[PDB]
Design a protein around this ligand. Structure first.
Ligand code: ADP
Ligand code: MG
Ligand code: MG
Length: 224
């Protein structure tokens, strides 16, 4: 069944918003979908336990009715690097558990999207990063680019390292994190030339609750 890992040029660039658009597009295409945020930090308390906002968005945007824990097995309250808070709270992050969770979703979904945490090299332990897990799973990678000054360098750095890891950069998504500025078209042209993967689409600046906006329309899944 189809599976994609979604990474970004940094934290706070639109990975979650773009992942929701991707999931909406896949449901529209007739797939049985599931979003997966194996590791999450920066989460709020509820009577059921901690809930992360990205995991909730992926859950809501999945075509299947999924239990929270199946979407997000590892939830940390403090918004810091996963390895730091995992070591502090004595709750190790295990590659095998992350992988089992992906398999569990595949029991029911035929199209699974996995959202990473932070950027490509976010540490999970003092000796293991998210990039290590993606490499183990041999997942095709989708790069989310928040269109802003500095994004060309970050997109190029991320694409080069993914390629060096022997992984496939399946595509990229442009996300308009701020209102339109002067060199938007020039930036889009530059990124299109430099990133060695198809541009899947562009999400416009959507000030109010973009995670639940109808954004599937901005993604062309036939390019993926
Ligand atoms: N296209 C968009 N339009 C306007 N707001 C955006 C857009 N994309 C992201 N946001 C806002 O920017 C912040 C970071 O987006 P998010 O998808 O959570 O980033 P990441 O998952 O990369 O950390 C959030 O507050 C989100 O609501
Ligand atoms: Mg975030
Ligand atoms: Mg996110």
């Amino acid at each position: 069944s189809k599976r994609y890992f979604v990474t970004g040029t940094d934290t706070e660039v639109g990975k979650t918003v773009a992942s929701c658009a991707l999931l909406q597009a896949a449901k529209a295409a007739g797939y049985r979908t599931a979003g997966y945020k194996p590791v999450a930090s920066g989460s709020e308390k509820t009577p059921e336990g901690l809930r992360n906002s990205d995991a909730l968005a992926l859950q809501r945007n999945s075509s299947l009715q999924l239990d929270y824990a199946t979407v997000n097995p590892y939830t940390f309250a403090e918004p810091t690097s996963p390895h730091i808070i995992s070591a502090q709270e004595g709750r190790p992050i295990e590659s095998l558990v992350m992988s089992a969770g992906l398999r569990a979703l595949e029991q029911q979904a035929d199209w699974v999207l996995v959202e990473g945490a932070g950027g490509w090299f976010t540490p999970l332990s003092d000796t293991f990063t998210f990039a290590d897990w993606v490499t183990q799973e041999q997942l095709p990678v989708i790069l989310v680019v928040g269109v802003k000054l500095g994004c060309i360098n970050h997109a190029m750095l991320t694409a080069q390292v993914i390629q060096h890891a022997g992984l496939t950069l399946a595509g990229w998504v442009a996300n308009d994190v701020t209102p339109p500025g002067k060199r938007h078209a020039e930036y889009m042209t530059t990124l299109t030339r430099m990133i060695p993967a198809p541009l899947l689409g562009e999400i416009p600046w959507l000030a109010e609750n973009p995670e639940n906006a109808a954004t599937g329309k901005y993604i062309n899944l036939a390019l993926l």
